[PDB]
Every structure is written in structure tokens, then in C-alpha cells.
Amino acid sequence: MTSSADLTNLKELLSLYKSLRFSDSVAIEKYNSLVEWGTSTYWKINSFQIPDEIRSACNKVLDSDNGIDFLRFVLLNNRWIMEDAISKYQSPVNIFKLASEYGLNIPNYLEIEIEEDTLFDDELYSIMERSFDDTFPKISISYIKLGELKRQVVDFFKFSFMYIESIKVDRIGDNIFIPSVITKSGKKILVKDVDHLIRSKVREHTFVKVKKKNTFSILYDYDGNGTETRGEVIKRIIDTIGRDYYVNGKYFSKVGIAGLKQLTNKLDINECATVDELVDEINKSGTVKRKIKNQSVFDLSRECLGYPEADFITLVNNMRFKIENCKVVNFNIENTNCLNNPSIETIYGNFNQFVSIFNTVTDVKKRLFE
Amino acid sequence: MNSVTISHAPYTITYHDDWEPVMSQLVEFYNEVASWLLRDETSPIPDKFFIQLKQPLRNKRVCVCGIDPYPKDGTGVPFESPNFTKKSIKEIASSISRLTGVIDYKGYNLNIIDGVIPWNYYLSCKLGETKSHAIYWDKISKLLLQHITKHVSVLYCLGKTDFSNIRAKLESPVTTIVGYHPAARDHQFEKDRSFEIINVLLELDNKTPINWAQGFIY
């Protein structure tokens, strides 16, 4: 009832099971048939970097069914609100509960049992809309029918032209802000990130397409006559936001102790909340002092920010400056073409942080070999 | 190492912690049965039976189910004997030595091999006969087996006809596989390979093999 034949079949399963990733075709078809046979005899056979707070719970709930290949999160308001995962056999009904058990933000799952496949209308979405209470701006009303791995998607909306007057920031978390487009008619409009704002060509004192929906209203993508190149937009908005914010990831952040933070990082020392604490920690560290001594404020304050080696220079050589006491007080870029390079604008938006850490390292280097 | 006092012989139950999700009811099922069991002498004696619940469940990697205790002078340890006199241990050591390669050996007992649980399904029986106490132990067994099968991911049943339906008597799709009695005739351990598949599905579940040599005495 157990022979050598089954042994041979399972041996081939053994050998090619973890060569399945890139096997040859006959192996994959044989495996489809041998998972078949063994199951009745042997019973076993555009998103970006999500930091770890979510990846831990992801690693747990992916153990709930090995058909799960990814998890689908909506990033909103600096929150990862899962809605489902790409599973092959497990209906997400356990999955959102699990993700709730593992610290993943889930929505208010108010799913009307649908018998006949239908698309929702005025009430059919409105009433669920009240019942949802989405402090998160999620506008896709989708219903999962259990028995499938897809969904029914309903959403209705208008669009018009709104007259912007100015652009703002709005704190949403720790030191983090978003743009709230302010209109000549006293209304605020939302966007997703900084790059949504950029892509829009958003400026002041004109009309633009906006998609108006009842619970939320979102600044509509762009469709018009674009002659205003990207760099001009980047420069304009970087000035408009103010000189106190740099751009971290999808968001802003004020310049502050994070400079001392990164710097203490780069020199293998303890956290120093103030500057004299820093100079002390350096001074007692003969190696850190002696490895500052050989360097320049410029090379060091750019190595503490990881700009690659060179294109930094194509930037630097494109602006004029204002210095006293060997210390930057002002600066301004005058040729805007370089910003049209991708690797360039990531450095440009991230500049005021570099200026500040530069002044700081200047000061410590002055007072240390003082 | 917890204990409970029971109604009748041997009045005491010393269970390891792995067995605590079930001991609660094992007492319940026992007090209403023992009064009958002990009307006659049995083997292994009443002072045995549950000896193999003080053993852990997490260290264990396969379990071997011999449906029955020795009809003549058992010890509460399945297939065990102090002077290698009984046939089951004899043929088991034989068909193991057949694959290991050493055939000069003092004795044998399956218990100390790491990863194996030597298990009876009926925890005792009258002297000289077999299966004579199946009317008493049935749910006790059913319960022990549900507990033990979610710790160990394999099942090798000894007995071609007795473990005929146990697929339906367990509700977890464990890797249950059936074998044949070697103490039986037609030389059933001569016509079946019983091992060399153990450390194979212990392979495909990405786990360590079974150390079939340690049970030899020298």
C-alpha cells in the first residue's frame, strides 16, 4: 500500500519543489500532477518600501494561507490602511480580522450580502457611506462576493474648476505636513503626497480641474496645456512651503535636532541633544576628533546626507550664496534645467537640512580645534 | 508534573504539562470505567497504563501506534521487554538492523530513540488474550489520539485491518499512513518497507530525520 513507486514520485517532488521558482516546463507540469497525487497520499507539497511596523504583521498574516502572495494597503494620511490581500484560496473575511489582531489598520467592513451581481446607486452607496465613518479618505466602495477573488467597484462623482488662491501645509503627525490647496472661495482641497502636487503644476490664482465628491473632494490630476517644465514647479513650491521644511519621503518635515541626530549617527557616538554636549563627546573621543581633523565641513556635511558623489556638484555650481563667518545664511539657484533630472530634484528638495547641518558642523569644528 | 487523584486504582495520575489540555476529562472517563476493568487481573498491571504521559510532546517527531499491549507480562511500555523475548520487538529490531547495517546487538527498546512515541491504542487488556478491553478504552483512546496527533505531524499505524477507518476518527488531515503487523504471518515485514519513508516526509516538511540506530543495546 506503500511501495517504491510512491517513493519515486515523492522524490521527484522533493527535488523540483524548490526548483519550481525557475524550473523547465515539464517539471512544472509534472509538479501540477504530483501535487495532485500526493495531496491524497502525503497531504503536503505600484507600491514601495513599507517599513517594518506593517511588515511584521504582514509576515504573520501571510502564514494564514499560503495562497497569500501580497497584501494590498492603501496609504492615507500617513497610515497603512489594509483592505485585503492577494490570496488564492482564503477569503479575506478572516484576513482583515487577523490584520486587526496583529496591529494593522482595517476599514469598517460593512458589506451588504449581494445575491444578484449589481452596482450600487444613490442610497445603495450613500447609506453605506454614512455607516462607514471613514476618518480616512477612502472613496472606493467595493464589495467582495465570497466565492471569488475579485470585487465589484462603485464610485460616482463630478468634476469642475476651482480657483486656487494659495497653498499651505497642515500638520498630520509628528513634524509632518501635507498641502491643503486654499481656494478663492474659502474651501480646502486635498492631495496624496508632494509628487501629486508637483504633477499637477499647481500654482496660485487660477482655475484647475478638481474632482468633487460628497464626503471628500480631491484635486484632479492634470490634463491641460503643459509648457511649464518640471524644475520651475519644483523651485516654486520649494520656496512657497517655506525655508523651514525639507522633504522626507512623501511628506515634509521641519529642520531641527534631526541634524544632530544624523550627525551623531555618522560618527559612532551617543545622542547629543545640544551642541556643546556634542563638542564634549567629540573631544573626549580622540579617534572621532582625529577623524574630523582631516576633513572639510563640506565633504563631511554631505557624507552625513548620502548624496552620491558628484551630481551634488552640478547642483552646487548652479546657485549663488550668502555667507558670513564662513557660515551660510542665504542661497538661491538661478539655472533651473538641472532639476529636470530625477537624481537632482531629490537632492534639491532635501537641501535646507543640509544647510543647517553645515552650519552646525562648521561651529563644532571651529570650537573643537579652538 | 501535575497530579490528580482518581477514583480507583492506581488512584494517581502524574501528567506532563503537554498533556494538560486533556487530563481534565481523562479522569472523568476513568472513574466510571475502572470499577469494571479491575474485576479481573490484567497486564500491564494497574500500576502502569499512563506511564507514558509524563513524557513531553514537543520533543517528539513521530509516533508509532501498536493497537495492543503485550498479552503476557507487559511493562506499560509498548513493544518493550527486558530480555528481548517478544516477537514484535524482535522483528522490529530485525527490519531496522536490515537498513542500519549493524546486526550484532544486545537488546532493543523503541523508547529512547529521540523523536518517537511508542504508543498503545488500548491501554491494557486481560491476560493471555487481546482486544478484550476495547469496550472500556475507546473514547479515552480517541481523546489521547486527537491530542497526540497535532503535536506530531506523522502517523504510522501498525495493523492492516484494525486501523482501517481511523482517517474518519481524526479531524485534522495529518499525514496518516498504514503499515502491517510484523509479528503476523505471511512475513508482512518482509513484504513491506515500513521505514525509509519516515525521514522522507520528515524531509518534505523540512525537518530532521529519525535516528533509527539509538534504540540498540550493546
Numbering used by the authors:
A (entry chain C): 1 to 45, 102 to 426
B (entry chain E): 1 to 218
Provide passages from the article that reported this PDB entry:
The MPXV DNA polymerase holoenzyme, consisting of F8, A22, and E4, is vital for replicating the viral genome and represents a crucial target for the development of antiviral drugs. Similar to vaccinia virus (VACV), another well-studied member of Poxviridae, the DNA polymerase holoenzyme of MPXV encoded by the viral genome contains three proteins: the uracil-DNA glycosylase E4, the processivity factor A22, and the DNA polymerase F8 belonging to the B-family polymerases, which correspond to D4, A20, and E9 in VACV, respectively. A22 works as a bridge for connecting F8 and E4, among which E4 is crucial for the association of viral DNA templates with enzymes to process efficiently.
Unexpectedly, unlike any other previously reported B-family polymerase, the holoenzyme complex is assembled as a dimer of heterotrimers. For clarity, two protomers are referred to as protomer A: F8/A22/E4 and protomer B: F8′/A22′/E4′. Structural analysis illustrated that in the hexameric form of the DNA polymerase holoenzyme from MPXV, the DNA polymerase F8 directly interacts with the uracil-DNA glycosylase E4, in contrast to the previous low-resolution models from VACV, which assumed that the complex is elongated in shape and the DNA polymerase and uracil-DNA glycosylase are separated. The structure of the F8 polymerase showed an open conformation, with 927 of its 1006 side chains assigned, including the N-terminal, exonuclease, palm, fingers, thumb domains, and five “poxvirus-specific” inserts (insert 0 to insert 4). To be noticed, when aligning F8 with yeast DNA polymerase δ, the thumb domain of F8 is engaged by the Neck domain of A22′ and also shows a clash between A22′ and substrate dsDNA, suggesting an inhibitory effect of A22 on the elongation of DNA polymerase in this structure (right).
